[model samples]
Target: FVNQHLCGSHLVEALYLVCGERGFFYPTKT
Candidate 1:
Protein backbone atom coordinates (compact mmCIF):
# COMPACT_ATOMS: atom_id res chain seq x y z
CA PHE A 1 0.00 0.00 0.00
CA VAL A 2 1.01 3.62 -0.51
CA ASN A 3 3.00 4.81 2.50
CA GLN A 4 1.70 8.36 2.14
CA HIS A 5 -1.64 10.12 2.72
CA LEU A 6 -3.45 13.32 3.82
CA CYS A 7 -5.78 14.10 6.70
CA GLY A 8 -7.26 16.86 8.90
CA SER A 9 -7.13 17.62 12.64
CA HIS A 10 -4.96 15.54 15.00
CA LEU A 11 -6.14 12.00 15.70
CA VAL A 12 -9.72 13.01 14.89
CA GLU A 13 -9.13 12.31 11.20
CA ALA A 14 -5.71 10.92 10.61
CA LEU A 15 -3.98 7.82 9.32
CA TYR A 16 -3.61 4.81 11.53
CA LEU A 17 -1.79 1.48 11.17
CA VAL A 18 -5.08 -0.32 11.59
CA CYS A 19 -4.02 -2.67 8.83
CA GLY A 20 -2.45 -2.92 5.38
CA GLU A 21 -5.61 -1.19 4.06
CA ARG A 22 -8.63 -2.88 5.48
CA GLY A 23 -9.00 -2.35 9.19
CA PHE A 24 -9.46 1.41 8.68
CA PHE A 25 -11.10 3.24 5.81
CA TYR A 26 -10.55 0.90 2.88
CA PRO A 27 -8.38 0.24 -0.11
CA THR A 28 -11.03 -0.19 -2.74
CA LYS A 29 -13.58 2.56 -3.44
CA THR A 30 -16.37 0.25 -4.41
Candidate 2:
Protein backbone atom coordinates (compact mmCIF):
# COMPACT_ATOMS: atom_id res chain seq x y z
CA PHE A 1 0.00 0.00 0.00
CA VAL A 2 1.16 3.48 -0.85
CA ASN A 3 0.06 7.05 -0.28
CA GLN A 4 -0.63 9.58 -2.96
CA HIS A 5 -2.43 12.81 -3.63
CA LEU A 6 -6.07 12.27 -4.52
CA CYS A 7 -6.02 15.01 -7.14
CA GLY A 8 -3.35 17.14 -8.70
CA SER A 9 -5.35 20.20 -7.79
CA HIS A 10 -4.81 19.76 -4.05
CA LEU A 11 -2.09 18.24 -1.84
CA VAL A 12 -4.49 15.99 -0.01
CA GLU A 13 -2.98 12.74 1.27
CA ALA A 14 -5.12 9.82 0.11
CA LEU A 15 -4.77 6.51 1.93
CA TYR A 16 -4.10 4.03 -0.91
CA LEU A 17 -4.20 0.72 0.91
CA VAL A 18 -4.10 -1.95 -1.81
CA CYS A 19 -3.16 -5.59 -1.57
CA GLY A 20 -1.29 -5.35 -4.85
CA GLU A 21 0.39 -2.63 -6.83
CA ARG A 22 -2.79 -1.79 -8.65
CA GLY A 23 -5.34 0.76 -7.59
CA PHE A 24 -6.87 3.97 -8.95
CA PHE A 25 -4.08 3.85 -11.55
CA TYR A 26 -1.75 1.11 -12.77
CA PRO A 27 1.58 1.00 -11.00
CA THR A 28 3.25 0.03 -14.23
CA LYS A 29 2.39 -0.67 -17.85
CA THR A 30 0.62 -3.99 -18.32
Candidate 3:
Protein backbone atom coordinates (compact mmCIF):
# COMPACT_ATOMS: atom_id res chain seq x y z
CA PHE A 1 0.00 0.00 0.00
CA VAL A 2 1.08 3.59 -0.54
CA ASN A 3 1.98 5.93 2.26
CA GLN A 4 -0.98 8.29 2.41
CA HIS A 5 1.01 11.20 3.76
CA LEU A 6 3.79 10.72 1.18
CA CYS A 7 2.14 11.26 -2.11
CA GLY A 8 2.26 13.95 -4.95
CA SER A 9 5.86 14.97 -4.32
CA HIS A 10 8.85 14.30 -6.61
CA LEU A 11 9.37 10.64 -5.82
CA VAL A 12 5.65 10.01 -5.82
CA GLU A 13 5.36 11.80 -9.16
CA ALA A 14 7.92 9.42 -10.60
CA LEU A 15 6.03 6.52 -9.15
CA TYR A 16 2.82 7.91 -10.56
CA LEU A 17 4.36 7.89 -14.01
CA VAL A 18 5.36 4.30 -13.57
CA CYS A 19 2.23 3.14 -11.78
CA GLY A 20 -0.31 5.66 -13.07
CA GLU A 21 -3.11 7.16 -10.99
CA ARG A 22 -5.57 4.95 -9.16
CA GLY A 23 -9.16 5.80 -8.19
CA PHE A 24 -9.64 7.35 -11.60
CA PHE A 25 -12.02 4.72 -12.89
CA TYR A 26 -13.29 3.67 -9.49
CA PRO A 27 -12.62 4.63 -5.88
CA THR A 28 -9.81 2.64 -4.28
CA LYS A 29 -10.48 0.92 -1.00
CA THR A 30 -8.13 1.28 1.90
Candidate 4:
Protein backbone atom coordinates (compact mmCIF):
# COMPACT_ATOMS: atom_id res chain seq x y z
CA PHE A 1 0.00 0.00 0.00
CA VAL A 2 2.99 2.28 -0.44
CA ASN A 3 2.34 5.64 -2.04
CA GLN A 4 3.96 6.76 -5.29
CA HIS A 5 4.37 10.26 -3.93
CA LEU A 6 6.50 8.90 -1.09
CA CYS A 7 8.51 6.77 -3.46
CA GLY A 8 10.16 9.83 -4.92
CA SER A 9 13.06 9.38 -2.49
CA HIS A 10 15.84 6.84 -2.93
CA LEU A 11 15.21 3.16 -2.25
CA VAL A 12 15.97 3.48 1.46
CA GLU A 13 13.68 6.44 2.03
CA ALA A 14 10.95 4.64 0.16
CA LEU A 15 11.00 1.80 2.68
CA TYR A 16 11.11 4.12 5.67
CA LEU A 17 8.18 6.09 4.34
CA VAL A 18 6.15 2.94 3.89
CA CYS A 19 6.92 1.66 7.38
CA GLY A 20 6.46 5.13 8.85
CA GLU A 21 8.84 6.86 11.26
CA ARG A 22 7.23 5.25 14.32
CA GLY A 23 7.15 1.56 13.41
CA PHE A 24 10.16 1.82 11.13
CA PHE A 25 12.21 0.80 14.15
CA TYR A 26 9.75 -1.84 15.36
CA PRO A 27 11.66 -4.60 13.60
CA THR A 28 14.87 -3.47 15.26
CA LYS A 29 13.35 -3.96 18.71
CA THR A 30 12.24 -7.45 17.84
Candidate 5:
Protein backbone atom coordinates (compact mmCIF):
# COMPACT_ATOMS: atom_id res chain seq x y z
CA PHE A 1 0.00 0.00 0.00
CA VAL A 2 2.76 2.41 0.90
CA ASN A 3 4.78 1.52 -2.18
CA GLN A 4 1.73 1.96 -4.35
CA HIS A 5 1.26 5.43 -2.98
CA LEU A 6 4.95 6.30 -3.27
CA CYS A 7 5.93 4.39 -6.44
CA GLY A 8 2.65 4.71 -8.27
CA SER A 9 0.13 2.01 -9.10
CA HIS A 10 2.65 0.14 -11.22
CA LEU A 11 3.60 -1.40 -7.92
CA VAL A 12 0.18 -2.94 -8.04
CA GLU A 13 0.85 -4.36 -11.48
CA ALA A 14 4.10 -5.87 -10.27
CA LEU A 15 2.31 -7.13 -7.22
CA TYR A 16 -0.33 -8.74 -9.40
CA LEU A 17 2.29 -10.19 -11.65
CA VAL A 18 3.97 -11.84 -8.71
CA CYS A 19 1.31 -12.15 -6.03
CA GLY A 20 -1.86 -12.61 -8.11
CA GLU A 21 -0.54 -15.67 -9.89
CA ARG A 22 1.18 -16.85 -6.71
CA GLY A 23 -0.53 -19.84 -5.17
CA PHE A 24 0.45 -18.49 -1.78
CA PHE A 25 -1.53 -15.35 -2.46
CA TYR A 26 -4.83 -17.23 -2.64
CA PRO A 27 -6.61 -18.27 0.47
CA THR A 28 -6.78 -22.05 0.83
CA LYS A 29 -10.11 -23.54 -0.10
CA THR A 30 -11.68 -25.94 2.29
Candidate 6:
Protein backbone atom coordinates (compact mmCIF):
# COMPACT_ATOMS: atom_id res chain seq x y z
CA PHE A 1 0.00 0.00 0.00
CA VAL A 2 2.76 2.41 0.81
CA ASN A 3 4.55 1.84 -2.47
CA GLN A 4 1.32 2.10 -4.41
CA HIS A 5 0.50 5.39 -2.73
CA LEU A 6 3.95 6.71 -3.45
CA CYS A 7 3.63 5.80 -7.10
CA GLY A 8 0.28 7.52 -7.31
CA SER A 9 1.71 10.67 -5.78
CA HIS A 10 4.56 10.66 -8.26
CA LEU A 11 2.14 10.07 -11.10
CA VAL A 12 0.32 13.26 -10.28
CA GLU A 13 3.58 15.18 -10.12
CA ALA A 14 4.69 13.71 -13.41
CA LEU A 15 1.36 14.49 -14.97
CA TYR A 16 1.70 18.10 -13.89
CA LEU A 17 5.15 18.34 -15.41
CA VAL A 18 4.09 16.79 -18.69
CA CYS A 19 0.99 18.90 -18.95
CA GLY A 20 2.76 22.01 -17.90
CA GLU A 21 5.57 21.63 -20.41
CA ARG A 22 4.05 19.69 -23.29
CA GLY A 23 0.56 21.11 -22.97
CA PHE A 24 -1.56 18.12 -21.89
CA PHE A 25 -0.77 15.28 -24.21
CA TYR A 26 -2.58 12.02 -23.62
CA PRO A 27 -0.76 9.54 -21.37
CA THR A 28 0.02 6.64 -23.68
CA LYS A 29 2.45 4.74 -21.44
CA THR A 30 2.61 3.33 -17.94
Measured over all alpha carbons after superposition, the RMSD of each candidate to the real structure, in angstroms, is 8.5, 7.9, 9.2, 6.4, 6.9, 7.9
Clashing pairs in 5: none
In candidate 6, stretches whose alpha carbon ends up further than 4 angstroms from where it belongs are 1-5, 20-30
Question: What value of lDDT does candidate 6 attain over all alpha carbons?
Answer: 0.66
lDDT of each: 0.46, 0.44, 0.59, 0.61, 0.61, 0.66
* Candidate 1 clash pair list: none
Per-residue lDDT over 1-30 for candidate 2, one digit per residue giving the tens place of the 0 to 100 score: 864555753332223443322455655667
Error of 3 at 29 (Å): 13
What tens-digit string does per-residue lDDT give for candidate 6 at 1-30? 344536776878867785755775567856
**Worst ten in a row by lDDT for model 4:** 2-11
Per-model TM against the reference: 0.17, 0.15, 0.31, 0.33, 0.31, 0.33
Candidate 1 local lDDT, 1-30, one digit each (tens):
654444454333443533433466656678
Please name the candidate that would achieve the greatest lDDT relative to the true structure: 6
Q: Candidate 3: RMSD over Cα atoms?
A: 9.2
- Model 2 collision count: 0
Q: Please give, for residues 1-30, the per-residue lDDT of candidate 5 as tens digits.
A: 344344566766676787755754657767
**Clashing residue pairs, candidate 6?**
none
Error of 5 at 22 (Å): 4.8
Candidate 5 residue runs with Cα over 4 Å from true position = 1-6, 22-30
Predicted candidate 1, C-alpha RMSD: 8.5
Residue lDDT tens for model 3, 1-30: 764555458776766666656533456657
Model 6 backbone overlap count: 0
TM-score of 6: 0.33
**What is the TM-score of candidate 4?**
0.33
